[PDB]
From a paper:
The AlkD/YtkR2/C10R5 enzymes belong to one of two known bacterial DNA glycosylase superfamilies that have evolved a non-base-flipping mechanism as a means to remove structurally diverse duplex-stabilizing adducts. By contrast, the BER pathway removes small nucleobase adducts, and is initiated by lesion-specific DNA glycosylases that hydrolyze the N-glycosidic bond to liberate the aberrant nucleobase from the DNA backbone. To understand AlkD’s lack of specificity for the three SCPCHD sub-types and comparatively high product affinity, we determined crystal structures of AlkD bound to DNA containing each of the three adducts. We previously showed that AlkD’s low level of protection against YTM results from product inhibition in which the enzyme remains bound to the newly formed abasic site in the DNA, slowing multiple-turnover excision, as well as impeding subsequent repair steps in the BER pathway.
Product complexes were generated by incubating AlkD with the corresponding DNA substrates, allowing for enzymatic hydrolysis of the N-glycosidic bond and formation of an AP site and a free nucleobase adduct. The conformations of AlkD and the abasic DNA are effectively identical in the three structures. Within the SCPCHD binding cleft, 14 protein residues contact one or more of the adducts. Only three—Gln38, Lys156, and Lys194—form adduct-specific hydrogen-bonding interactions. Gln38 interacts with the hydroxyl and methoxy substituents of the S−1 subunit unique to YTM, while Lys194 interacts with the methoxy substituent of the S+2 subunit unique to CC-1065. Lys156 contacts all three adducts but only forms a hydrogen-bonding interaction with the hydroxyl substituent specific to the S+1 subunit of CC-1065. YtkR2 also provided significant resistance against CC-1065, which was somewhat unexpected because of the presence of the unique S+2 subunit, and suggests that interactions with this subunit do not play an important role in determining substrate specificity. Indeed, the outward face of the S+2 subunit is largely solvent exposed and has the fewest protein contacts of any subunit. Thus, AlkD’s substrate-binding cleft can accommodate each SCPCHD compound with strikingly few adduct-specific interactions.
Numbering used by the authors: -1 to 225
DNA sequence: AGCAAGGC
DNA sequence: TGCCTTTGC
């Protein structure tokens, strides 16, 4: 049972606004891994602010506590709300939080949570602390947890000109032989995105290094006309 | 705004 | 394969 007053309040307010007809297609979209209340993102964020303005954003001492309690509730809107709350504490998230973010990645895992945790929060941490990459990324690749492997691929997604090209291509080479849908997809995604910045090096990489066909097609889909 | 980014 | 729905840029 949740015991933090903010979480109890958010649970009551969200639950009061559930829509079972809406919850069904929302849950099916996430392959029925999760129950849903049936609250889509615009309403969900207004209902969150309803609770924040009563209680005030909780002291930062509680932020992990609050996110963990929301992560433990069954309906997916509580994890989506938890991510919205993390965005409000961005300032206080730093390298000491990497293990916490790891736990979130591997608990109630799916693309909707992992893709929100990794490029923003881990991306920012490793930009400030790039000497720490080697303590996490190799371990994530070797874990055969597909969401930590996707995290290794995607933490640089939004780096643009900050991209560590040699590291990106090494990570991709370690994972190119994965059968996994979400790994083949992530490789295609990061290569297509980085090609917006550095197309020539993505072209050369894809022409000289093995990739699954889905990944290769995605990587080059907006630059192949130039070569 | 109106363009862009899983599901099937 | 490429269009759909919802969410993000
Ligand atoms: C080529 O360059 C670009 C441009 O060039 C250019 C623009 C852009 C903008 C981008 C660009 O990139 N954006 C934009 C859109 C987006 C990015 C992005 O980064 C992301 O990652 C950080 C994005 N993450 C998501 C995402 O989380 N989604 C989305 C949704 C799931 N969904 C639905 N329908 C689809 N078709 C999907 N496809 C993949 N997911 C899909 C969904 C979630 C999350 C959830 O919890 C969901 N719960 C239920 C649903 C349905 C659901 C969206 C997203 N790039 C651009 C704007 C103008 N412009 C111009 N003028 O030129
Ligand atoms: Ca392996
Ligand atoms: Ca797609």
């Amino acid at each position: 049972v949740p015991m933090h007053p903010f979480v109890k309040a958010l649970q009551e307010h969200f639950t009061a606004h559930q829509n079972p007809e809406k919850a069904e297609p929302m849950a099916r979209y996430m392959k029925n891994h999760f129950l849903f209340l049936g609250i889509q993102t615009p309403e969900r964020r207004q209902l969150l602010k309803d609770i924040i303005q009563i209680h005030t954003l909780p002291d930062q001492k509680d932020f992990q506590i609050i996110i963990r309690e929301l992560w433990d509730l069954p309906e997916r809107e509580f994890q989506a709300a938890a991510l919205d709350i993390m965005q409000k504490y961005k300032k206080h998230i730093n390298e000491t939080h990497i293990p916490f973010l790891e736990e979130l990645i591997v608990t109630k895992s799916w693309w909707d949570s992992v893709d929100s945790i990794v490029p923003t929060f881990l991306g920012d941490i490793f930009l400030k602390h790039p000497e720490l990459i080697s303590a996490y990324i190799p371990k994530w690749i070797a874990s055969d947890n597909i969401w930590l492997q996707r995290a290794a691929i995607l933490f640089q997604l939004k780096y643009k000109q900050k991209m560590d090209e040699e590291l990106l291509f090494w990570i991709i080479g370690q994972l190119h032989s994965s059968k996994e849908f979400f790994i083949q997809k992530a490789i295609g995604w990061v290569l297509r995105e980085y090609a917006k910045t550095n197309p020539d090096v993505v072209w050369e990489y894809v022409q000289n290094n093995e990739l699954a066909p889905l990944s290769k097609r995605e990587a080059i889909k907006h630059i192949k006309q130039n070569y």
